[PDB]
């Protein structure tokens, strides 16, 4: 069984390791890192690579072994490293919701007001408050408190005899994440679900406001210099080559309206038909008319699953199994901690496949990063 | 659960042993603390799943048979005095929380 | 005229909105 378990924790390993480093160079060869939309999940990848690359090979180490041969510096060092790291990329979960939340609430003024600056600062924060959550803690509750609680040759978080400071930092860490990321995630899901009927009701008020009130309103508002609609102009001109794409793939019926509707905008200039267009095709595709939006809200309901439920299965076990022990503290039998401490680090294989992997621009690059070619 | 030391020692190599009826020591964790006045917790050697050891000379095996630990010590220092407490049932516990009934009796080795 | 602009400032923040979704793949 000793060597069933190496084989299954070393290829989760190596597959960490190959999952995150190709995440790290795909953006580097590739000349599209220009997003600071990206930016999360490159430091995302940051964490997970560490936890990849050295948190699953060290604990399999301490029980396969079952022992910390390494010594009590390396036992506290690889605590607050992974500790932190896990915390890090919690918290750059919680830093994406924030993200898309704001993104999806309001679009305009969150897109506007964010500059690659302030992005790079965001994650600092969301890397500075895992520090300082917990590796004070781990790495110095042995001073708080002056004695080494954890056993010669065990390694687990030293400050957890405490009863209301657990509780506290199981808060801190997974509870309150949880229930803001489950809420901003079910106003995400509702926000999309109010985007289908609003996109709806947009596209039949076209049809309705003859088409030159809508351009003079187009002209009232990009003459009015205003950040917000600057910004949204130039990001609305650089996706309209990959835009047209999805008039190919809309209805029959749709790409007659859209083909009649642009020879109208024919002779105007590029920042106000392609600025037009966007907005004709966007209430188009995702208004939703009959079962379009049934399947969009459908689809973001299970991505939205299974990006949660990879949280929940992944550290509500832990997490429990912490709280309950400090209320009975002869319970959880020592077989289901341990494989609910690894469970953990099966977070850090699998995020790749849900947010990088998960994207067009990656996938693909992969290939051209491993295949030589 | 009683832990009953059964080295009595105050060898001028030695071989202590530990007598513990445990239930389930069954990839647990057994140990040895050489309590003396330097350090009333300090490290001595372990047993271990696996069969793999890490000291602080000294040689330490183990026995699941009857939950038995032989910690055959060689060419032990005069520094090595101390009063070694067996430590099973450390299982090296996360926060200590099934059973720390390590404590038990603990020997007289003098060398 | 005041209300074709605010249309305008809804459906521009819109195909923002479907094209940060588009760009999180959650739509
Ligand atoms: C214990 N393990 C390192 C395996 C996982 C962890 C951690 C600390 O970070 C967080 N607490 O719970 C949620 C995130």
Redesign the pocket.
């Known amino acids: 069984q000793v060597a069933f378990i190496g084989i299954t924790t070393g290829l989760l390993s190596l597959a960490t390791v190959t999952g995150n480093l190709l995440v790290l160079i795909s953006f580097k060869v590739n000349t599209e890192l220009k997003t600071v939309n990206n930016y999360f999940l490159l430091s995302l990848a940051c964490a997970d690579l560490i936890i990849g690359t050295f948190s699953m090979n060290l604990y399999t180490t301490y029980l396969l072994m079952g022992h910390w041969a390494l010594g009590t510096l390396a036992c506290d060092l690889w605590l607050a490293l992974?500790?932190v790291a896990?915390?890090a990329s919690?918290m750059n979960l919680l830093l994406i919701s924030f993200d898309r939340y704001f993104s999806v609430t309001r679009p305009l003024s969150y897109r506007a007001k964010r500059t690659p600056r302030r992005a790079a600062l965001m994650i600092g924060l969301a890397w500075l408050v895992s520090f300082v959550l917990?590796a004070p803690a781990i790495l110095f509750w042995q001073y708080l408190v002056g004695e080494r609680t954890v056993l010669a040759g065990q390694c687990y978080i030293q400050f957890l005899s405490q009863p209301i400071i657990t509780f506290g930092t199981?808060m801190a860490?997974?509870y309150l994440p949880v229930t803001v990321m489950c809420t901003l995630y079910w106003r995400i899901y509702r926000e999309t679900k109010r985007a289908g009927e609003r996109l709806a009701k947009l596209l039949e008020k076209f049809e309705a406001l003859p088409l030159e009130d809508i351009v003079a309103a187009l002209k009232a508002l990009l003459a009015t210099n205003r950040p917000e609609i600057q910004l949204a102009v130039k990001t609305i001109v650089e996706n309209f080559p990959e835009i047209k794409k999805e008039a190919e793939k809309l209805t029959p019926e749709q790409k007659a309206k859209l083909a009649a509707l642009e020879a109208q905008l024919a002779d105007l200039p590029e920042e106000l038909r392609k600025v037009l267009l966007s907005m004709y095709l966007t209430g188009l595709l995702y208004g939703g008319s009959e079962e379009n939006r049934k399947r969009a809200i459908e689809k973001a309901a299970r991505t939205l699953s299974a990006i949660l439920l990879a949280f929940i299965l992944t550290?509500t076990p832990?997490?429990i199994m912490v709280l309950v022990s400090t209320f009975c503290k002869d319970c959880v039998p020592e077989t289901l901690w341990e494989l609910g401490?690894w469970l953990?680090?099966v977070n850090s294989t699998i995020n790749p496949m849900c947010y990088a992997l998960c994207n067009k621009a990656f996938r693909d690059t992969f290939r051209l990063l491993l295949l030589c070619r | 659960v009683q832990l009953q030391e059964s080295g009595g020692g105050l060898v001028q190599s030695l071989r202590l042993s530990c007598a513990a009826s445990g239930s389930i020591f069954y990839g647990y964790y057994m140990g040895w603390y050489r309590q003396a006045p330097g350090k009333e917790r300090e490290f001595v050697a372990t047993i271990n799943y696996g069969a793999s050891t890490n000291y602080a000379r000294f040689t330490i095996s183990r026995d699941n048979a009857k939950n038995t630990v032989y910690l055959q010590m060689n060419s032990l220092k005069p520094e090595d005095t101390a009063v070694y407490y067996c430590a099973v049932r450390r299982v090296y516990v996360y926060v200590q929380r099934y059973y720390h009934y390590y404590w038990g009796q603990g020997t007289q080795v003098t060398v | 005229t005041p209300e074709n602009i605010r249309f305008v400032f809804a459906a521009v923040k819109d195909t923002i909105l479907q094209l940060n979704l588009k760009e999180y793949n959650l739509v």
Do not use: G
Request: charged share 5%.
């Open positions: 992974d500790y896990s915390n919690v917990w199981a860490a997974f550290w832990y997490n401490y953990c680090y």
